[PDB]
């Protein structure tokens, strides 16, 4: 009953519910069965970079996601969010294991967005910037097992002391302030976000992702969306 | 019980506690009774600016108030802000009418606060602007009589269908997200705020002013603030 | 031989030379005939405000005209600006009058270009705002009849001490530094423009326009470039 | 006859003119002998942080000098900049050597420059940010040993081929845009820059500094401004 849009960083393919078999990114409009996605060649221990825009002129959605010295892998995608979210949001990032597990750790996050009325030409804008998160990050709202403050990062997976990544394990962190995301169908907000993440597993298989999303205010963790689910639908639909 | 901080734009004079006999702004630490003051030339009904300064590197707090083609007043207070406030904190627009009355009329809002951190040297940042204030404003806490909506206005006190201000009121708004204010481990911590303003009144005397703050992050108009503790003090001390 | 990008605002419609019969708001690639145009119900008198931007994850050119409360007139066009322009480039604003005429007055300017590096993942920026333009602008290069601090305006054409534009005029205002606009080793590059702009004319038909442009650092006005080729192109090519 | 506003990073004592007896930061006014100084304790072989910032509130200029994981150095100085230097600007990086040597290597740099109207209450900005020098960085006027582009950063001073600082070397890189300082007493800009940077010697004596400057637009290097004068002087008056 959540509303979600996301970038997913998918690292296990759920092919019974429409992944690719493949490591890859997507675009989720109302749905983990993404409308787009490309193939995302994940590096085991390496920081990568993801960064996600919003162009309000075309209602195009994108996002890019890389590491230090390699290619990236970039998706698209047209959508209008104003026929989707609703006016008020908030944004997050979100991420889970399953059967399989890696760390989901976020070295730094910002985000800016600016909502310009057609009334008046002038601006409401947001800007944040995390590059240190400490343990009591009171302009954060985290869920479920994510927690800030080791080594300044956020985990948003259950770490063991050992350093060791848990399964079945779902967590989020929100920014605490709303966002207006669009006043009406011609004046709809610009963003952009971006964030550094470290995924790190033992196994093979590194299981299950990290997504940005942006869902109604009041938001919540779904019952069993651990997993394929990455934290953001009550199934697959 | 609450740690307040401000600048007031304070437009009646109350002798009988500290005020010199004339409009003024005025630094407040902890107290009503300001620790620096300046006179303010106000023009009634002329839309004004403030502009709020501090950075850990003077630790100085400036503040400038100023109308289109007229001499600035400006005041600052050497002050030590991680001894005063707590870490955290929200930071807000006051105003209250007592006997006399004024509209406490806000036209824009901007704020930005940056803490960089002592050896990665990176940032920390919030950054918001108000141009625009709609009906349902979720990004701000709307406390007492503030409304937000009226002509795109935040209006702070209570403003009849006349565009007639009364008196006896009092009301807030705080920036929905807490603001991480001071690090003790931050080579330089600085913040700005910027706001527009309309203060209109059919008497000879407008009461009581305008403020911005900041405070802890639960604070709350204190029992007993309308008048001339401007919706910030629980009494003259 | 000046390779040139542009927005332009066309008043005035060249059916000769491929012009739509109306107003309209035009992508120019290294032509005056532009590779895509939209309908521009221009009002004569009132300020109105373009906003153009790229990125290069996109790759996509889009711009945007308004006046406040009228529906806004929109143009995109996909396009690899790294296969288009030089590695350095300057920015401006154009406007030329021929045997019609109008004022062609800038009230503000301002620019974003961002480019980040693709495995640092640092960022090189250049900002830069006006909203008010003095008599002695030296941070503007000013090419033909292009003059500033009349009323704190750039007035791109002539005008008379009347306020009365003149017919065969032009001339161009550039941003001092040379701008790193598009390199091959950048994850994302992007740039954002945003004038606002006032057009009066006396006549029945105004003319000829207004363009924002990007061109070779030592680009100057091309022989013969008055009236419609709007002070950007040497021949109707 | 140049007018030059500096923070001095001074590596090298020399007493004869003023100097303290120890490396140290300092605030020149049209003058090498500092109005201000304060001890810096240098580290050989690390990347540093300058922090320049100047309040036009106040009318205060302050620097910060730090490395990661040490305490750092502060210098402030009133001084009404409305005075001293004229209405339009450069800025800029500066460094020498003399008899004694080290790299002056900045690794990055930025600067942002506001001037609001008290007109119009309208802001002109200027922001810049280098996180890279490429071989041809078209933004920055070069002078004397000045060079960029090895391993992405900006050589102050020269450097031979095996990476060994050269004697009696003086090299400067000024922003290529011209920086609006000051309209009236009243009207006078904030500015801040920031840098980082890497001093190496061979000897046990490092010498002589680098520092940030604002001058008259057309400054070019001194004649016989290498060693103590750090490029900024004719003289030592
Ligand atoms: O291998 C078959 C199988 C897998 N899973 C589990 O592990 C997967 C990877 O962690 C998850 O995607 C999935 O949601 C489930 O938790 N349950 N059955
Ligand atoms: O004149 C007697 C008198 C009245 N008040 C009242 O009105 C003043 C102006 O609004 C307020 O400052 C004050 O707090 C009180 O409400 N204070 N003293
Ligand atoms: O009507 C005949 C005619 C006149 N012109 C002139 O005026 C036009 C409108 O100003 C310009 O577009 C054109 O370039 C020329 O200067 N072009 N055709
Ligand atoms: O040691 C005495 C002496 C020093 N210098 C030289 O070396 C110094 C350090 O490089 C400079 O400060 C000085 O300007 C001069 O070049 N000339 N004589
Ligand atoms: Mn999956
Ligand atoms: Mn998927
Ligand atoms: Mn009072
Ligand atoms: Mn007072
Ligand atoms: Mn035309
Ligand atoms: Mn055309
Ligand atoms: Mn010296
Ligand atoms: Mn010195």
Do not use: A, Y
């Given at each position: 009953a959540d509303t979600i849009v996301a970038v997913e960083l998918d690292t296990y393919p759920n092919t019974d519910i429409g992944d690719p078999s493949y490591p890859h990114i997507g675009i989720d409009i109302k749905s983990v069965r993404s409308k787009k996605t490309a193939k995302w060649n994940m590096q085991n221990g390496k920081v990568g970079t993801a960064h996600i825009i919003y162009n309000s002129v075309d209602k195009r959605l994108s996002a890019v996601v890389s590491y230090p010295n390699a290619d990236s892998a970039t998706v698209s995608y047209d959508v209008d969010l104003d026929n989707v979210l609703p006016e008020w949001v908030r944004v997050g990032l979100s991420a889970s294991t399953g059967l399989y597990k890696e760390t989901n750790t976020i070295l730094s996050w910002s985000f800016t967005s600016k909502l310009k009325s057609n009334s008046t030409h002038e601006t409401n804008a947001l800007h944040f910037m995390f590059n240190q998160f400490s343990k009591?990050?009171?302009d954060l709202i985290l869920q479920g097992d994510a927690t800030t403050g080791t080594d300044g990062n956020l985990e948003l997976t259950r770490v063991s002391s050992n350093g060791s990544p848990q399964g079945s394990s779902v967590g989020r962190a929100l920014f605490y302030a709303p966002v207006?995301?669009?006043?009406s169908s011609a004046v709809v907000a610009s963003f952009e976000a971006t964030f550094t993440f470290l995924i790190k597993s033992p196994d093979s298989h590194p299981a299950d992702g990290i997504a940005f999303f942006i869902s109604n205010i009041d938001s919540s963790i779904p019952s069993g969306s651990t997993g394929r689910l990455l934290g953001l639908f009550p199934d697959a639909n």
């Open positions: 009591d990050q009171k207006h995301i669009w006043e």
